[PDB]
Design a protein around this ligand. Structure first.
Ligand code: HEM
Ligand code: HEM
Ligand SMILES: [C-]#N
Ligand SMILES: [C-]#N
Ligand code: NA
Lengths: 127, 126
């Protein structure tokens, strides 16, 4: 945990400073309420099992932001390839993530930092 | 609350100035009485959950005015998109908010300050 990490003089991860697994879970839940309420986005998920997806997204974001738990989902490029997702869609999704982070009280500077980790993933996500 | 924030040497926000979350609740109720009575505005709210909207409006205004809690609703552009809202409509709503603030006894100068925060939002709403 964070205490062990600090005892080892390891820098505080984004994961730890935003509140770890519980924070990520809450953010991902809200993120998906936002995404599924967005008529430009909801249809992408029509044939999707949301229950499982939220789980994999928690694992993915946690791992991306410095958490210890494994990602147990499929590779980004394979999952998203062929879904007709454009940079327009990717950007809307990123906007919803930023909104969920803001709603959870994460400082704007940290939101920007998180967008810096996530934005390069568009190369694997978009059509 | 305001007491703890002053102990931290935070400058007084507009939110804290006008009476905080409880003052904003009261203003928002009166605001919508005015809005829904306005024939030029009321049809936009046909079918709207007023209780929910009012709560999100309290959150929004409280946050914009420097309050302690984040806004948790949808952003202004998304929510108002495709409704054909014009500068005329926005101006009417801003007018009703100012009148509600006036009725609540907020000093004219502070209402002017609040309108300075609200008026730029028209780019997203319209
Ligand atoms: C913001 C960056 C994104 C990340 C980190 C991400 C991550 C993920 C992850 C972890 C999964 C689960 C993979 C699995 O099932 O093993 C997934 C699936 C999925 N993603 Fe994303 N994604 C992103 C952007 C997007 C965008 C922009 C769209 C469409 C607008 C999208 C649409 C989908 C859909 C529809 C699935 C589920 C496919 C199915 O039905 O199983 N994703 N994504
Ligand atoms: C003073 C600027 C305004 C602000 C701060 C504002 C704020 C908001 C907020 C916070 C919501 C709720 C968002 C959510 O559900 O997450 C909302 C929705 C809405 N607004 Fe505004 N608004 C403004 C101007 C206007 C104007 C000028 C109109 C039309 C005359 C309008 C009509 C509506 C309607 C119809 C909804 C949707 C209610 C529903 O979901 O059924 N707003 N607005
Ligand atoms: C993808 N969520
Ligand atoms: C919007 N009221
Ligand atoms: Na695919």
């Amino acid at each position: 945990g964070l205490l062990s990490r600090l005892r080892k003089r390891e820098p505080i991860s984004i994961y730890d400073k935003i509140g770890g697994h519980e924070a990520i879970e809450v953010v991902v839940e809200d993120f998906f309420v936002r995404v599924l309420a967005d008529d430009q986005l909801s249809a992408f998920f029509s044939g999707t099992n949301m229950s499982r997806l939220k789980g994999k997204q928690v694992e993915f974001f946690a791992a991306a932001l410095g958490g210890p738990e494994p990602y147990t989902g499929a590779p980004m490029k394979q999952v998203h390839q062929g879904r007709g997702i454009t940079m327009h869609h990717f950007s809307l999704v990123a906007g919803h993530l930023a909104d969920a982070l803001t709603a959870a009280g994460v400082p704007s500077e940290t939101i920007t930092e998180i967008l810096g980790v996530i934005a390069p993933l568009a190369v694997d996500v978009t059509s």
